[PDB]
């Protein structure tokens, strides 16, 4: 057993964090007390769930988690909500004044004054770990704390834990729920600074999730509660292999090995099905063929893009529920003949497959229906570079006029970090095109 430390940065990171540990606690049979009746080794252990949860002598199961925000409000809700007794107070770190949707303020100004405290608290979790494999970092691209503080933390974590893997779950900005116009700047800045320090990053476009919630859950105007409970399901499908008995993606190094041949091109596309409204009165249960075919529909992806006009370099299918290998292989054969699935010439055209027999847990009184079988496809495709193009375009429009730049320069940052960040992304777009055609 090798431990994983989850780090939640900013509002998005923290709130996606809540939804995740809620969902884990349900999946593993842990109560809000921290008490796990099914766990028989009291006061310790080295089961698969102990990757995410440490243990105390009283039988309490405590997330290997740190929540950090530069502002008390949202972490104060974690301190006083349903799961308050799950987390030790030293895991929940808050500042006073936030980063005002400014990367530079989060990175340079307020980052400098809080970085050493956050590392001290992360060091206290790493010290109670027998064999730490590394970190799962949750954050937005758009916030100041999410963009700016995360990128600093990632640079530090590299120094203090060079041999440890770092995975990201990053929230990509969408105008339908954005709170700032400078999110494109913040996103390119943090992507530039974090690129070398992240082994594998899962981007979730709030636009894709918002539409899935309207289209498939029949929700008029989705809130962060709606979006996060869906995000947490996708996150859980991805982390299930680390928390449950299995032989695919059992450690953080395998995510990189299985999904990331090129170190810079480390952004796999996540696609999830089925997403079914709880309120839906009568529902035909979808077959293995149907949910697997739904993984190649842009409408079900975490980032809207078109894999038909790109190349795959790796592709994992992660099933949950009543699924056998015979049905998965038959489904792939059918799918392959009807669809455009080009791999790069230097990888085998093929699929790593993992099945867990427990179907997806749903939060009681949520929007998602119980289902007999679900799947998350994790495919590294060049088509996700569409998300960089969109973002780089918006950056260029504003930056040619130097609009809002004075806010960043005011905090110590130099105008040249913008163009560096930008031309790094230019090269990244050019890497994806080189691999893709």
């Amino acid at each position: 057993m090798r431990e994983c430390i989850s780090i939640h940065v900013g509002q998005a990171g923290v709130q996606i964090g809540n939804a995740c540990w809620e969902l884990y606690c349900l999946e593993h049979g842990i109560q809000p007390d921290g008490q796990m009746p099914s766990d028989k080794t009291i006061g310790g252990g080295d089961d698969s769930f102990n990757t995410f949860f440490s243990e105390t002598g009283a039988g309490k199961h405590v997330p290997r988690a740190v929540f950090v925000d530069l502002e008390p409000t949202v972490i104060d809700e974690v301190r006083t909500g349903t799961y308050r007794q799950l987390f030790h107070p030293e895991q929940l770190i808050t500042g006073k004044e936030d980063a005002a949707n400014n990367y530079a303020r989060g990175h340079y100004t307020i980052g400098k004054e809080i970085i050493d405290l956050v590392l001290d608290r992360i060091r206290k979790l790493a010290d109670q770990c027998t064999g730490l494999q590394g970190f799962l970092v949750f954050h937005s691209f758009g916030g100041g704390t999410g963009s700016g503080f995360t990128s600093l933390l990632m640079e530090r974590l590299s120094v203090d834990y060079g041999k440890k893997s770092k995975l990201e779950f990053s929230i990509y900005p969408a105008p339908q729920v954005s709170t700032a116009v400078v999110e494109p700047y913040n996103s390119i800045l943090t992507t530039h600074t974090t690129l070398e320090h992240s082994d594998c990053a899962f981007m979730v476009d709030n636009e894709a999730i918002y539409d899935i919630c309207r289209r498939n859950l029949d929700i008029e105007r989705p809130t962060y509660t709606n979006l996060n409970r869906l995000i947490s399901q996708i996150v859980s499908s991805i982390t299930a292999s680390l928390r449950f008995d299995g032989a695919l993606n059992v450690d953080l190094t395998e995510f990189q090995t299985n999904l990331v041949p090129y170190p810079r091109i480390h952004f796999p596309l996540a696609t999830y099905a089925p997403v079914i409204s709880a309120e839906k009165a009568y529902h035909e249960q979808l077959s293995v063929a149907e949910i697997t075919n739904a993984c190649f529909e842009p409408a079900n992806q975490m980032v809207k893009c078109d894999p038909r006009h790109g190349k795959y370099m790796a592709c994992c299918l992660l099933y949950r529920g009543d699924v056998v290998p015979k049905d998965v292989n038959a489904a792939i054969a059918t799918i392959k003949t009807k669809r455009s699935i080009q791999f790069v010439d230097w990888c085998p055209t093929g699929f790593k497959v993992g099945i867990n027999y427990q179907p997806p847990t749903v939060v009681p009184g949520g929007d998602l229906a119980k289902v007999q079988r679900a799947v998350c496809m994790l495919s590294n495709t060049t088509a996700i570079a569409e998300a960089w193009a969109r973002l780089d375009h918006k950056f260029d429009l504003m930056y040619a006029k130097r609009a809002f730049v004075h806010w960043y320069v005011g905090e110590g940052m130099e105008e040249g970090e913008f163009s560096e960040a930008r031309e790094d992304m230019a090269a990244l777009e050019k890497d994806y095109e080189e691999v893709g055609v």
């Binding site: 006073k96 116009v181 400078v182 008029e220 918006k394 504003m398 609009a403 809002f404």
Partner: protein
């Protein structure tokens, strides 16, 4: 607690400031003695933004009342909500300033300003996390314009890393006949360009025309004007006073609204426009609020929005309504009129919804726009200014307090530069 320290200076400043406190006290269920008598916990969640909390569960406005004469502040003390304010926060002289910016900024106002700052210091030191300062004043008089800008400059020196916010009332010949108001306004605008982060341009020309043309009041009073100012002031501070997502503090508002430091002058709007008493029995639909809040006839700055382009916009809807329908209607406005929103700031309109409507209404909308059309307001002042200044007319009232003509030339220059700067971005 993210505390804002409020200052109100001069007749206009103290009059619209007094009315602001009346309106928001009613919205937060605070009565004239400072006692809470509301039926909702949403009212108290962010009460510390504007109110200190004393013993006896008493709420006191974080408000400093400044003037160089006693008349307007005796009127405020004697008024209905007057007993709410902290008594040591009333700071006033006897001289007055004679509608003279030089007297307010340099001579009469200099004598009183350090006792204002002592009260500001006391209120500031008491704050766990101070956001900054909001000032109400006119730019056409003496105390509010001259002394008010002096205060801004001194506060900036003590608190260089806090946000400075103003509600600046612009003079119009439709409301005032004091000949030297363009002088006082141009001098005050010079100060506002250098030393404020966000300025709401409340234009008396617009307020008069709304009252005359739209509200059908043939003889408007200051009270009629101020009723539109207080609605706007209630509206634009909603995001600061209730939970909690978009433009929830002064710095976040500024990072959204101010793409270049000097271009921080905003054009507020409001729907529905109402006069006092005269009853709105019919609530507006989401489509009407959205049409009306963007209408020229609903702007509190007398500028034609079609004559410029929007750099940034904040729209804030109040009352119980469909969030879906707000989103549709907002997208509809920017898609049907896309050429008035600069292409080079993507997604430059942001939208908030608060569940609690203002007094006497079920549905309201408040618009805050940073439009290049605001140059028309400054251009109007500049023309009124240059007409006199090219013959050095009335300048002896200012040089007799020790000012030189060079100050006037510099202020004239900086404002004409502001105008050409707005025209620069209107044509990109």
């Amino acid at each position: 607690m993210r505390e804002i320290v409020h200052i109100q200076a001069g007749q206009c400043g103290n009059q619209i400031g007094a009315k602001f406190w009346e309106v928001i006290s009613d919205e937060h269920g605070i009565d004239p003695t400072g006692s809470y008598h509301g039926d909702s916990d949403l009212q108290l969640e962010r009460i510390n933004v504007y109110y200190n909390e004393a013993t006896g569960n008493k709420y006191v406005p974080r408000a400093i009342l400044v003037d160089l004469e006693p008349g307007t502040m005796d009127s405020v003390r004697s008024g209905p909500f007057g007993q709410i304010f902290r008594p040591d926060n009333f700071v006033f002289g006897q001289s007055g300033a004679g509608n003279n910016w030089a007297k307010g900024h340099y001579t009469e106002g200099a004598e009183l300003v350090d006792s204002v700052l002592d009260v500001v210091r006391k209120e500031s030191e008491s704050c766990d996390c101070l956001q900054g300062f909001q000032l109400t004043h006119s730019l056409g008089g003496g105390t509010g314009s001259g002394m008010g800008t002096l205060l801004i400059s001194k506060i900036r020196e003590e608190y260089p890393d806090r946000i400075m916010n103003t509600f600046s009332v612009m003079p119009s010949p439709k409301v005032s006949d004091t000949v030297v108001e363009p002088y006082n306004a141009t001098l005050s605008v010079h100060q506002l360009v250098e030393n404020t982060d966000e300025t709401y341009c409340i234009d008396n020309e617009a307020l008069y025309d709304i009252c005359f043309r739209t509200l059908k009041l043939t003889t408007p009073t200051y009270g009629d004007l101020n009723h539109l100012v207080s609605a706007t002031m209630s509206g634009v501070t909603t995001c600061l006073r209730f939970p909690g997502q978009l433009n929830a503090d002064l710095r976040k508002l500024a990072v959204n609204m101010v793409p270049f430091p000097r271009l921080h002058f905003f054009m507020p709007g409001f729907a529905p426009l109402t006069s006092r008493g005269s009853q709105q029995y019919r609530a507006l639909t989401v489509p009407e609020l959205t049409q009306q809040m963007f209408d020229s006839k609903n702007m509190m700055a007398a500028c034609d929005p079609r004559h410029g382009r929007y750099l940034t916009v904040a729209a804030i809807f109040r009352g119980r309504m469909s969030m879906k329908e707000v989103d549709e209607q907002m997208l509809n406005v920017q898609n049907k009129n896309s050429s008035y929103f600069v292409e080079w700031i993507p997604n430059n309109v942001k939208t908030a919804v608060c569940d609690i409507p203002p007094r006497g209404l079920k549905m309201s909308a408040t618009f805050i726009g940073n439009s290049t059309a605001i140059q028309e307001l400054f251009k109007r002042i500049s023309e009124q200014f240059t007409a006199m200044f090219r013959r050095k007319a009335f300048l002896h009232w200012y040089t007799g307090e020790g000012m030189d003509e060079m100050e006037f030339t510099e202020a004239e220059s900086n404002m004409n530069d502001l105008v050409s700067e707005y025209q620069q971005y209107q044509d990109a």
